[PDB]
Design a protein around this ligand. Sequence first.
Ligand SMILES: *[C@@H]1O[C@H](CO)[C@@H](O[C@@H]2O[C@H](CO)[C@@H](O[C@@H]3O[C@H](CO[C@H]4O[C@H](CO[C@H]5O[C@H](CO)[C@@H](O)[C@H](O)[C@@H]5O)[C@@H](O)[C@H](O[C@H]5O[C@H](CO)[C@@H](O)[C@H](O)[C@@H]5O)[C@@H]4O)[C@@H](O)[C@H](O[C@H]4O[C@H](CO)[C@@H](O)[C@H](O)[C@@H]4O[C@H]4O[C@H](CO)[C@@H](O)[C@H](O)[C@@H]4O[C@H]4O[C@H](CO)[C@@H](O)[C@H](O)[C@@H]4O)[C@@H]3O)[C@H](O)[C@H]2NC(C)=O)[C@H](O)[C@H]1NC(C)=O
Ligand SMILES: *[C@@H]1O[C@H](CO)[C@@H](O[C@@H]2O[C@H](CO)[C@@H](O[C@@H]3O[C@H](CO[C@H]4O[C@H](CO[C@H]5O[C@H](CO)[C@@H](O)[C@H](O)[C@@H]5O)[C@@H](O)[C@H](O[C@H]5O[C@H](CO)[C@@H](O)[C@H](O)[C@@H]5O)[C@@H]4O)[C@@H](O)[C@H](O[C@H]4O[C@H](CO)[C@@H](O)[C@H](O)[C@@H]4O[C@H]4O[C@H](CO)[C@@H](O)[C@H](O)[C@@H]4O[C@H]4O[C@H](CO)[C@@H](O)[C@H](O)[C@@H]4O)[C@@H]3O)[C@H](O)[C@H]2NC(C)=O)[C@H](O)[C@H]1NC(C)=O
Ligand SMILES: *[C@@H]1O[C@H](CO)[C@@H](O[C@@H]2O[C@H](CO)[C@@H](O[C@@H]3O[C@H](CO[C@H]4O[C@H](CO[C@H]5O[C@H](CO)[C@@H](O)[C@H](O)[C@@H]5O)[C@@H](O)[C@H](O[C@H]5O[C@H](CO)[C@@H](O)[C@H](O)[C@@H]5O)[C@@H]4O)[C@@H](O)[C@H](O[C@H]4O[C@H](CO)[C@@H](O)[C@H](O)[C@@H]4O[C@H]4O[C@H](CO)[C@@H](O)[C@H](O)[C@@H]4O[C@H]4O[C@H](CO)[C@@H](O)[C@H](O)[C@@H]4O)[C@@H]3O)[C@H](O)[C@H]2NC(C)=O)[C@H](O)[C@H]1NC(C)=O
Ligand SMILES: *[C@@H]1O[C@H](CO)[C@@H](O[C@@H]2O[C@H](CO)[C@@H](O)[C@H](O)[C@H]2NC(C)=O)[C@H](O)[C@H]1NC(C)=O
Ligand SMILES: *[C@@H]1O[C@H](CO)[C@@H](O[C@@H]2O[C@H](CO)[C@@H](O)[C@H](O)[C@H]2NC(C)=O)[C@H](O)[C@H]1NC(C)=O
Ligand SMILES: *[C@@H]1O[C@H](CO)[C@@H](O[C@@H]2O[C@H](CO)[C@@H](O)[C@H](O)[C@H]2NC(C)=O)[C@H](O)[C@H]1NC(C)=O
Ligand SMILES: *[C@@H]1O[C@H](CO)[C@@H](O[C@@H]2O[C@H](CO)[C@@H](O)[C@H](O)[C@H]2NC(C)=O)[C@H](O)[C@H]1NC(C)=O
Ligand SMILES: *[C@@H]1O[C@H](CO)[C@@H](O[C@@H]2O[C@H](CO)[C@@H](O)[C@H](O)[C@H]2NC(C)=O)[C@H](O)[C@H]1NC(C)=O
Ligand SMILES: *[C@@H]1O[C@H](CO)[C@@H](O[C@@H]2O[C@H](CO)[C@@H](O)[C@H](O)[C@H]2NC(C)=O)[C@H](O)[C@H]1NC(C)=O
Ligand SMILES: [Ca+2]
Ligand SMILES: [Ca+2]
Ligand SMILES: [Ca+2]
Ligand SMILES: [Ca+2]
Lengths: 387, 387, 387, 387
Amino acid sequence: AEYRNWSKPQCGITGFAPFSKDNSIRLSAGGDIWVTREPYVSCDPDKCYQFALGQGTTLNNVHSNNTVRDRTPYRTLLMNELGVPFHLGTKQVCIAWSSSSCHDGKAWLHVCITGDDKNATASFIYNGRLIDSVVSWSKDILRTQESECVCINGTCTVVMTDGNATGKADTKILFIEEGKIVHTSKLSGSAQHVEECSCYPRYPGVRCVCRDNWKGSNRPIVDINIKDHSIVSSYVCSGLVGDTPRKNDSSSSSHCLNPNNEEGGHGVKGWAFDDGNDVWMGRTINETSRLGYETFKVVEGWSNPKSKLQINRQVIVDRGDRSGYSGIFSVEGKSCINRCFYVELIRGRKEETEVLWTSNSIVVFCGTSGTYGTGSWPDGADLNLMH
Amino acid sequence: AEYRNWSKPQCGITGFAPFSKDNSIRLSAGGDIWVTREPYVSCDPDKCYQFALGQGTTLNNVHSNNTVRDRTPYRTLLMNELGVPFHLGTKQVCIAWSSSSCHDGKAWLHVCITGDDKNATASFIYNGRLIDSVVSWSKDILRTQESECVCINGTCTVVMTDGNATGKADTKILFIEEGKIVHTSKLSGSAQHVEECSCYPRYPGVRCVCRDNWKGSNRPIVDINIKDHSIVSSYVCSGLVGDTPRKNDSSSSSHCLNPNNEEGGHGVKGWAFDDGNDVWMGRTINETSRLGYETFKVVEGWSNPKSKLQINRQVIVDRGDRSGYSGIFSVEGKSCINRCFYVELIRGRKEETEVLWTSNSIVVFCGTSGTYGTGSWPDGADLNLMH
Amino acid sequence: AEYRNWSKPQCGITGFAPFSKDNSIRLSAGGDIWVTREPYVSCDPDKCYQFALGQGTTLNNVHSNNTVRDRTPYRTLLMNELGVPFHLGTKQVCIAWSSSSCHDGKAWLHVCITGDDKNATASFIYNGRLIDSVVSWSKDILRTQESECVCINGTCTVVMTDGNATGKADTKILFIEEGKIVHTSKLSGSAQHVEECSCYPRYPGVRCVCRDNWKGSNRPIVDINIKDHSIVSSYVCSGLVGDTPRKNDSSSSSHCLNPNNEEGGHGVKGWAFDDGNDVWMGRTINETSRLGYETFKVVEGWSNPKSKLQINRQVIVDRGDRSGYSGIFSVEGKSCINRCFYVELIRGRKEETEVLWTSNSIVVFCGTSGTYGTGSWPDGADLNLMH
Amino acid sequence: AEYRNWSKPQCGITGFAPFSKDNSIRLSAGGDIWVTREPYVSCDPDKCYQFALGQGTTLNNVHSNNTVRDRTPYRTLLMNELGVPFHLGTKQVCIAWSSSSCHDGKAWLHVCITGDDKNATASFIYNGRLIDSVVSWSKDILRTQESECVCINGTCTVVMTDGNATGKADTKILFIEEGKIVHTSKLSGSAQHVEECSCYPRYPGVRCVCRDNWKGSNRPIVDINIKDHSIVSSYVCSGLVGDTPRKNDSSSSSHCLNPNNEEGGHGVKGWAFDDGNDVWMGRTINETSRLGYETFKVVEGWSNPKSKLQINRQVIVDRGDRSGYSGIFSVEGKSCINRCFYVELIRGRKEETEVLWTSNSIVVFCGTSGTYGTGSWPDGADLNLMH
Ligand SMILES: *[C@@H]1O[C@H](CO)[C@@H](O[C@@H]2O[C@H](CO)[C@@H](O[C@@H]3O[C@H](CO[C@H]4O[C@H](CO[C@H]5O[C@H](CO)[C@@H](O)[C@H](O)[C@@H]5O)[C@@H](O)[C@H](O[C@H]5O[C@H](CO)[C@@H](O)[C@H](O)[C@@H]5O)[C@@H]4O)[C@@H](O)[C@H](O[C@H]4O[C@H](CO)[C@@H](O)[C@H](O)[C@@H]4O[C@H]4O[C@H](CO)[C@@H](O)[C@H](O)[C@@H]4O[C@H]4O[C@H](CO)[C@@H](O)[C@H](O)[C@@H]4O)[C@@H]3O)[C@H](O)[C@H]2NC(C)=O)[C@H](O)[C@H]1NC(C)=O
Ligand SMILES: *[C@@H]1O[C@H](CO)[C@@H](O[C@@H]2O[C@H](CO)[C@@H](O[C@@H]3O[C@H](CO[C@H]4O[C@H](CO[C@H]5O[C@H](CO)[C@@H](O)[C@H](O)[C@@H]5O)[C@@H](O)[C@H](O[C@H]5O[C@H](CO)[C@@H](O)[C@H](O)[C@@H]5O)[C@@H]4O)[C@@H](O)[C@H](O[C@H]4O[C@H](CO)[C@@H](O)[C@H](O)[C@@H]4O[C@H]4O[C@H](CO)[C@@H](O)[C@H](O)[C@@H]4O[C@H]4O[C@H](CO)[C@@H](O)[C@H](O)[C@@H]4O)[C@@H]3O)[C@H](O)[C@H]2NC(C)=O)[C@H](O)[C@H]1NC(C)=O
Ligand SMILES: *[C@@H]1O[C@H](CO)[C@@H](O[C@@H]2O[C@H](CO)[C@@H](O[C@@H]3O[C@H](CO[C@H]4O[C@H](CO[C@H]5O[C@H](CO)[C@@H](O)[C@H](O)[C@@H]5O)[C@@H](O)[C@H](O[C@H]5O[C@H](CO)[C@@H](O)[C@H](O)[C@@H]5O)[C@@H]4O)[C@@H](O)[C@H](O[C@H]4O[C@H](CO)[C@@H](O)[C@H](O)[C@@H]4O[C@H]4O[C@H](CO)[C@@H](O)[C@H](O)[C@@H]4O[C@H]4O[C@H](CO)[C@@H](O)[C@H](O)[C@@H]4O)[C@@H]3O)[C@H](O)[C@H]2NC(C)=O)[C@H](O)[C@H]1NC(C)=O
Ligand SMILES: *[C@@H]1O[C@H](CO)[C@@H](O[C@@H]2O[C@H](CO)[C@@H](O)[C@H](O)[C@H]2NC(C)=O)[C@H](O)[C@H]1NC(C)=O
Ligand SMILES: *[C@@H]1O[C@H](CO)[C@@H](O[C@@H]2O[C@H](CO)[C@@H](O)[C@H](O)[C@H]2NC(C)=O)[C@H](O)[C@H]1NC(C)=O
Ligand SMILES: *[C@@H]1O[C@H](CO)[C@@H](O[C@@H]2O[C@H](CO)[C@@H](O)[C@H](O)[C@H]2NC(C)=O)[C@H](O)[C@H]1NC(C)=O
Ligand SMILES: *[C@@H]1O[C@H](CO)[C@@H](O[C@@H]2O[C@H](CO)[C@@H](O)[C@H](O)[C@H]2NC(C)=O)[C@H](O)[C@H]1NC(C)=O
Ligand SMILES: *[C@@H]1O[C@H](CO)[C@@H](O[C@@H]2O[C@H](CO)[C@@H](O)[C@H](O)[C@H]2NC(C)=O)[C@H](O)[C@H]1NC(C)=O
Ligand SMILES: *[C@@H]1O[C@H](CO)[C@@H](O[C@@H]2O[C@H](CO)[C@@H](O)[C@H](O)[C@H]2NC(C)=O)[C@H](O)[C@H]1NC(C)=O
Ligand SMILES: [Ca+2]
Ligand SMILES: [Ca+2]
Ligand SMILES: [Ca+2]
Ligand SMILES: [Ca+2]
């Protein structure tokens, strides 16, 4: 077995085709299913896997009460093959209320953060063995991507943040080899606040589209040179911005090198990627809450901050149904690298009070060069009947 | 590992021997079992697998209400080893309310159709990665075989239909190589309406026996030349016809090249195959509803439209118990290709109103050259006790 | 991989050491567990597997009512690794209300009998594919060993019976190669009635100790020459007889070549094997019902019909707890062949009326050349609490 | 595959990082989970596994009543991959109310003790086959380590004890090769009473830190020469003693070669290991009951009986939550041997009377040479809600 290099061109993409759906919440009304949140997908050279942060409990279970909370000692990283719902046979690969995983061609790396908010620990687990660990450096919720990291040759990059979420924080890029931290780079550039990055290989390096909880609804970009460990950062230029909350499509604006100072203070994990000067992106349909999910291409949106020209829109989750985090993963093919994405479908507290729990299911789409129709693939659970 | 060619003679067949039974519904009264329909079987070079379209729910579950419906966003293709019932550990391999799967000797191909009725998407997934996709062409429920496809050398064929079910529709044969659609052929011949084909390798090509919802109770045949992509079609000549509804065995008639215009408008998935001039077939026992299942050979039934001479009848499901879809799969042996079949055993709405759900179990028989007795292997669940 | 020959000497045996216990019934009071009976054990070159005839239902399930019945269309052969209880993920390898399985070094063979009592079908499944089948020859419950068969070189033997149980029947020995019946030998010798044989390799051939429902409480022996397919039969000489019902140890008698005409009409599956002129055997402790299980060696018991000299007695199940069928399996070691056995622990109807079901758990002991203590390992479920 | 030698240096350790947590009890309030106690961890060259002594029942199950008892015929050794909770699919690898397991690089060895208290049997199972067994020698609860054994070259050592727990007993060290007992050494040295040893490879030999139920709260040490089978024993010198009950840190004393005669009569399984003249150890936080768990290094604590200078303290379980047994396991790396430990988190009777059962979950930490923060990772189940 060989290290991955991702040294192939991105595949031609006219849009996205359905790929997987787990129906986790619907099953949990008649079965023993983990309570989860912050899920993601990542693939080794053979199969794809779905991950999520468990809440140390099943859904039909007294311990699912108050699982809206984000950090407990009971949260672990769950790992299953894509399409296998999180049942009692699921392997808990580490302790974590924030995590990232990736496969370098030979083995899995998991970055797992747990412990106290003001003094958390990141554990680096490679090939099933703990290789390294680092303590929180700003003493304020050390946290990482909640989606897959990227390994090129033998070196994996992962973006971690520590500090005030709605303000100035310390973001670092770690370079990890067989689980060992071999270098640490500070975030550099014009992206001020960066969190929950959705990274993807863009040979010779790594590109990430992130979440800005501070001063903007246009997403930060972080480019990682995996050889000299240099970092450049900016924002997705597209005048159609990708975060939530945001202004409506008439009033919204963006900049290539600065936050847009529109609907700052909040945000959501999301993704985008470049196709020449165009950008492919997803986002919630509703501008203020996490309802619906839509995907489209913005013509010149990767370079033109005034471009509002979208095309190839697809509705993934219709506007009336709940969405959540979303993120990108990459799949190596015969001759090109495809881009896929997952959407977290959050149900429960606080927005829905019929139940006491908070959990999610997922839906997964993959890039295609063929043709496709329309549809909507929501969570589909009836919370009024789950009593 | 090598591509399959199926370049062996069909095995001598005196009838069929019991092979597998899952008891899915009986278990679901005391366990967490998927609600399913439209199941089928297919084998890689080593093991056999059972597939079905899940309904995104278990049986003992509030979400099993109204699962008589055929297309929802929650339906996925379930895949287990043959004999393993669909429990919560079952892998959902794709999103689908219509599907087909086959193994070419190296990896699995899944054809998965989901989305809106008037604008559905077929996803082509090979070796766990999405390779291609195509949109509905007639904007009227793009749909496929609900049983295994067939791969010869590296090329898999699958029959898809789009358009009016009880009338004129557009049926195409797709040629797929490592998940990529390499050619598309239009249905040609005297079979007017063709749906839910049961295909089997008949080297050098592929043969299918299908369902005619339009003008006939004799089953359409489709012959696929896998090299030049040419298509010839006709009907099973046998005066004992294989569809449901149908006329009684005295009044029924058939033609080799035309629908019999008897009990048109309805139908059911089924199968048949040729043994020289004879045809081996199965069908429901009751002429008007899906009750019972019987298998027999019609002497000269593959070529004589007037032949009503059956022999080697076996009762698979006695006349008083519910059956459903059935289909063929092929198993490569040491020196010959065997033919096997599955029978869907449907329970629930609308015909049985004691419950609110609709699901099935299955029973599987394989061709034999030995001897066999008699029996009946129904679903066996007591719906009156499942409250 | 190579065919097994079992061409090693039997290991030195001073008794038996605990090996595995599944606690199936205790678990079923708080989990989804198959209802089973007639279990057995068999090992491929790497691991050991436990088999049983399922009743097409779990225990906590309305369909477990009246599972005292022996033959239904819903019974299947369950197969798990030894120590894994029969949960919903268990593979049902075939349809069967009577079965036998063995591994020849390359793949598994399963002999599976199902269908009507007066017209049953034996299915021969090798390496996951149906290879052969045979119909009942006496039209009276074709039935087989309910324990492992034995393969030497490439040839597996299995003993099947058809006809009146409490009288004259037709017993045949089948020789099976890669699932194909290559020869059939009629039972020959002085063993008149032979059923539910417990066979074990005794190179160059196969030896079986069986159950006589007709005229005796001393167990029949069947020796199978695997090359010329010749059969010799007799009885276990030991004056301490191995069947149930039987006379007390003072009044019991035996013969090497004839049934003892004591407590004829009934019986139970069991086992014994030779150690020079000595016999190692197990049997129920109670003489009339299936209570307790004990193992011992009878000095000269393999050749002396008057020998009542036992030694190395071990209690496996104390006299007050329920036992059932038991049987032998063989495990190839570095330089010798060990002998092990399982005991079925039956609970439920008809003897226990607190519940409506009938099922079993198992306990497994293996031959040892070391030392051992005492104990008792019953089923341990409290049926009064399972309501 | 090759035998393990553990011929690498111990890894540099600044403390311990979180590694795994199973949340077994929280899940059992909404799922079918084994009742267990006395768990441990052990790793083959590829993955780590979690073991425990099952009680032959699940938690939500009438048979979990009175599972505070230590020895029943229903207790079996459960084995799962680390992180997979003990669900109904868990393999019961042997019968045991006391056990030890280890992997020599080629296969697993399990030492399994069951049977009567005054006449128990140890079964030695290697590569899935029973190879040897030995009877109790002092006729008073033959018992072993309840954590992993250690194999160097092809030879595994395991420490077993038989006799009065709160007094003089007979402790032997067994040397096992491919499951066969090849030598037996009597405990020799100044450690009088030795039980439940936590052993770890310290090339060229094996070192164990044990529990003294007799005359001391300082832990016995046993050094095993794996070539000449010689045994030296002593006590952990550290003036901060590792057992429970114990005196407070001001009043406690220790000796290198004698029990401290403080809080004799009781004790708990635990661990420690040497780092030059320093000792790394864990222990309960509360001096008298099994509440809390803390880890630290005692400067010169491996050689100085008066040293009370601790540093690098970490709280594993805060002082108000229940702990239990703990033990060490070793993980071979690229160039060094790491040391990890597990902590049993006991819930239920007798200390907690809201429920009738007694069970545990676990938490696992691994040695690290990086940095870490703080936290507390208790069991987290709410027993008041589990009714
Ligand atoms: C079955 O499924 C398939 C696959 O899913 C479906 O096909 C997909 O359908 C969707 C939905 O329509 C399409 O996405 C939309 O695309 C258009 C852009 O494409 C159109 O316009 C292009 C540019 O045209 C202009 O220039 C050309 C010269 O270059 C000139 O000729 C022309 O007259 C015009 O001036 C055309 O190139 C393009 O034609 C091509 O494609 C056609 C297929 O669509 C085909 O017929 C042609 O042959 C040719 O190949 C095409 O006409 C986007 O406009 C659109 O996004 C708007 O609409 C969505 C709702 O769909 C809405 O959510 C968005 O916000 C956005 O709406 C804003 O913009 C509109 C235009 O500015 C405006 O009308 C709206 O009111 C709204 O304005 C608001 O926002 C803007 C900023 O965005 C702001 O400034 C305003 O103030 C205000 O706030 C979608 O992205 C897919 O491309 C299409 N996919 C494929 C592969 O074909 C199919 O529908 C399904 N079939 C059935 C039966 O269900
Ligand atoms: C911890 O666990 C271990 C391992 O499990 C336990 O050790 C095991 O213990 C069991 C139970 O005792 C033993 O099995 C029994 O074995 C004896 C046979 O062995 C004894 O007798 C041998 C022959 O002695 C005669 O000849 C010699 C000369 O050859 C002469 O010296 C002697 O005086 C006598 O004349 C001896 O060789 C043998 O000694 C050897 O072993 C000893 C250990 O046991 C050891 O001390 C010696 O050093 C030496 O090595 C030994 O004394 C069987 O008799 C016995 O079976 C009877 O008892 C069981 C109940 O245990 C009962 O169910 C059976 O039915 C049977 O009882 C019938 O026969 C008896 C004798 O005829 C009679 O007294 C009974 O009333 C009864 O009679 C009825 O049946 C007969 C037909 O059977 C009928 O004709 C009558 O009319 C009537 O109906 C057991 O098989 C194991 O061998 C032993 N295992 C080992 C490895 O040591 C240990 O007990 C446990 N420890 C603790 C503390 O729990
Ligand atoms: C985020 O997480 C990280 C990682 O977990 C946290 O960092 C860890 O924090 C813990 C908790 O403090 C530390 O463990 C404690 O370590 C100290 C020993 O280290 C201190 O003392 C050393 C010796 O100092 C002496 O000598 C030097 C010269 O050699 C001289 O300069 C000095 O003045 C003094 O005389 C120092 O080397 C050491 O400094 C080093 O480390 C510092 C970081 O801590 C750093 O600032 C320095 O730069 C330098 O590198 C340091 O000052 C142990 O004393 C302590 O154990 C005591 O406390 C725990 C509670 O924490 C208690 O449970 C123990 O029982 C014990 O308390 C007894 O002893 C005390 C001293 O004797 C006494 O005050 C207590 O009352 C008590 O006495 C009782 O017991 C004794 C016997 O034990 C008995 O005789 C008495 O009668 C009585 O019964 C802990 O082990 C970790 O080392 C530290 N880890 C790391 C990697 O840094 C961090 O806190 C977290 N951050 C946040 C914001 O949460
Ligand atoms: C996190 O950072 C934000 C900066 O965005 C801080 O909020 C600012 O606080 C000052 C002083 O109270 C106000 O004048 C500003 O209006 C706030 N800014 C915004 C954008 O609302 C916040 O206090 C920081 N948190 C901590 C704990 O330091
Ligand atoms: C689907 O096709 C059928 C043809 O079989 C159409 O039904 C026919 O409709 C015409 C006009 O209403 C009637 O005169 C015929 O008697 C019908 N034929 C039969 C066999 O019943 C049907 O309308 C078509 N559906 C659509 C949506 O076009
Ligand atoms: C085929 O099945 C149908 C039911 O689908 C049977 O028709 C029923 O017959 C009984 C007795 O004649 C009537 O009371 C019912 O009203 C009928 N049911 C329905 C739904 O129409 C029919 O008898 C079966 N045919 C054969 C040959 O067995
Ligand atoms: C099965 O065989 C037994 C022979 O063991 C038959 O039972 C005998 O029947 C005759 C005639 O009724 C009686 O005189 C004998 O006493 C019976 N023998 C015994 C040992 O009880 C039995 O009838 C046979 N069953 C069938 C269906 O033929
Ligand atoms: C187990 O050993 C202990 C020795 O520690 C025995 O307890 C002692 O018994 C004597 C006589 O009754 C007392 O004088 C001592 O005070 C006891 N010692 C302690 C430390 O409490 C105990 O009896 C032994 N058990 C058996 C069954 O022999
Ligand atoms: C160690 O744990 C024990 C309990 O095992 C604690 O003792 C309890 O203390 C409270 C408050 O002092 C008393 O009300 C209880 O009666 C005690 N319980 C028992 C069972 O004795 C003790 O406080 C703990 N010690 C430390 C240092 O935390
Ligand atoms: Ca934002
Ligand atoms: Ca029809
Ligand atoms: Ca008998
Ligand atoms: Ca002690």
